[PDB]
């Protein structure tokens, strides 16, 4: 067990999320965004006006990688924005397309949300 | 609405969760001169034992994979002998999440829908 469980999880966590970012990455083209860039936005928009601290931590990024991405998202003029807040809807929508692409009912999603929420708890 | 809500949730949770995981392999991997990805590569190179078929099972641009395999260092005959301490790192890592062996398998039952 212990050997082959912790090994499955390893391959599974890698691959499953490896393919999740893949689908995200296609949709995010329409906006010239990196999946990581996307994540930052979704976070930014729920808090708004947060130090690179409450943010850099909430997105698990060292001040080193976050600064350049913040700058980038700024030239993009999504953060520096009113246009940014405009696409909150179509961006959010991307999370729905991505998981539908995996045939996930709201039943499967809930079950996963709970397993993952505990895992990370 | 709800479909939007749950996606949001799955998204954040998958992102946040794979961050906590990689972060932990990062520590433990220092023993070897390996990177997290360099580690999945090895774990994969070991499960299979073709380069373009590898970039695929491991999901990496051969523009990012080429450097990596070269390195992998004699990791071979001693890569086999080193295969269990390797394996144990996954145990060391997932054990830090203090989860039961059932929940452990649940996550596996769930994580499959993202492979099927």
Coordinates of N, CA and C in Angstrom, one line a residue, chain A residues 74-119:
Chain A
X74 N 0.3 44.0 -16.1 CA 0.1 45.5 -16.1 C 0.3 46.1 -17.5
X75 N 1.2 45.6 -18.3 CA 1.3 46.1 -19.6 C 0.1 45.7 -20.3
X76 N -0.3 44.4 -20.0 CA -1.6 43.8 -20.6 C -2.7 44.8 -20.2
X77 N -2.5 45.6 -19.3 CA -3.5 46.6 -18.8 C -4.7 45.9 -18.2
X78 N -4.4 44.9 -17.3 CA -5.5 44.2 -16.6 C -5.3 44.6 -15.1
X79 N -4.1 45.0 -14.8 CA -3.7 45.4 -13.5 C -2.6 46.5 -13.8
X80 N -2.4 47.5 -12.9 CA -1.4 48.5 -13.2 C -1.0 49.1 -11.8
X81 N -7.5 46.9 -13.8 CA -8.0 48.0 -14.7 C -9.5 47.8 -14.9
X82 N -10.1 48.9 -15.5 CA -11.5 48.8 -15.7 C -11.9 47.8 -16.8
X83 N -11.0 47.6 -17.8 CA -11.2 46.7 -18.8 C -11.0 45.3 -18.2
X84 N -10.0 45.2 -17.3 CA -9.7 44.0 -16.6 C -11.0 43.5 -15.9
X85 N -11.7 44.3 -15.1 CA -12.9 43.9 -14.4 C -14.0 43.5 -15.4
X86 N -13.8 43.9 -16.7 CA -14.8 43.7 -17.7 C -14.8 42.2 -18.1
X87 N -13.6 41.6 -18.2 CA -13.5 40.2 -18.6 C -13.6 39.2 -17.4
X88 N -14.0 39.6 -16.2 CA -14.1 38.7 -15.1 C -15.0 37.6 -15.4
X89 N -16.1 37.9 -16.1 CA -17.1 37.0 -16.5 C -16.6 36.0 -17.6
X90 N -16.1 36.4 -18.7 CA -15.6 35.5 -19.7 C -14.4 34.6 -19.2
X91 N -13.6 35.2 -18.3 CA -12.4 34.5 -17.7 C -13.0 33.4 -16.8
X92 N -13.9 33.7 -15.9 CA -14.5 32.8 -15.0 C -15.1 31.6 -15.8
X93 N -15.7 32.0 -16.9 CA -16.3 31.1 -17.8 C -15.4 30.0 -18.3
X94 N -14.1 30.4 -18.4 CA -13.1 29.4 -18.8 C -12.9 28.2 -17.9
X95 N -13.2 28.4 -16.6 CA -13.1 27.3 -15.7 C -14.2 26.3 -15.9
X96 N -15.3 26.8 -16.5 CA -16.5 25.9 -16.7 C -16.2 25.1 -18.0
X97 N -15.7 25.7 -19.0 CA -15.4 25.0 -20.2 C -14.3 23.9 -19.9
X98 N -13.2 24.3 -19.3 CA -12.2 23.4 -18.9 C -12.6 22.1 -18.2
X99 N -13.5 22.2 -17.2 CA -13.9 21.0 -16.5 C -15.0 20.2 -17.2
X100 N -15.7 20.9 -18.1 CA -16.8 20.2 -18.9 C -16.0 19.3 -19.8
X101 N -14.9 19.8 -20.3 CA -14.0 19.1 -21.2 C -13.5 17.8 -20.6
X102 N -13.8 17.6 -19.3 CA -13.4 16.4 -18.6 C -14.7 15.7 -18.1
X103 N -15.8 16.1 -18.6 CA -17.1 15.5 -18.2 C -17.3 15.4 -16.7
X104 N -17.2 16.5 -16.1 CA -17.4 16.6 -14.6 C -18.7 17.1 -14.2
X105 N -19.6 16.3 -13.7 CA -20.9 16.8 -13.2 C -20.6 17.7 -12.0
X106 N -21.6 18.3 -11.5 CA -21.4 19.2 -10.3 C -21.3 18.2 -9.1
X107 N -21.6 17.0 -9.4 CA -21.6 15.9 -8.4 C -20.1 15.5 -8.2
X108 N -19.5 15.2 -9.4 CA -18.1 14.8 -9.3 C -17.2 16.0 -8.8
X109 N -17.5 17.2 -9.2 CA -16.8 18.4 -8.8 C -16.8 18.5 -7.3
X110 N -18.0 18.4 -6.7 CA -18.2 18.5 -5.3 C -17.3 17.5 -4.6
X111 N -17.4 16.2 -5.0 CA -16.6 15.2 -4.4 C -15.1 15.5 -4.5
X112 N -14.7 16.0 -5.6 CA -13.3 16.3 -5.8 C -12.9 17.6 -4.9
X113 N -13.8 18.5 -4.8 CA -13.6 19.7 -4.1 C -13.4 19.4 -2.6
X114 N -14.1 18.4 -2.1 CA -14.0 17.9 -0.7 C -12.7 17.1 -0.5
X115 N -12.4 16.2 -1.4 CA -11.2 15.4 -1.2 C -10.0 16.4 -1.2
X116 N -9.9 17.3 -2.1 CA -8.8 18.2 -2.2 C -8.8 19.3 -1.1
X117 N -10.0 19.7 -0.7 CA -10.0 20.6 0.4 C -9.5 20.0 1.7
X118 N -9.8 18.7 1.9 CA -9.2 18.1 3.1 C -7.7 17.9 2.9
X119 N -7.3 17.3 1.8 CA -5.9 17.1 1.5 C -5.1 18.3 1.9

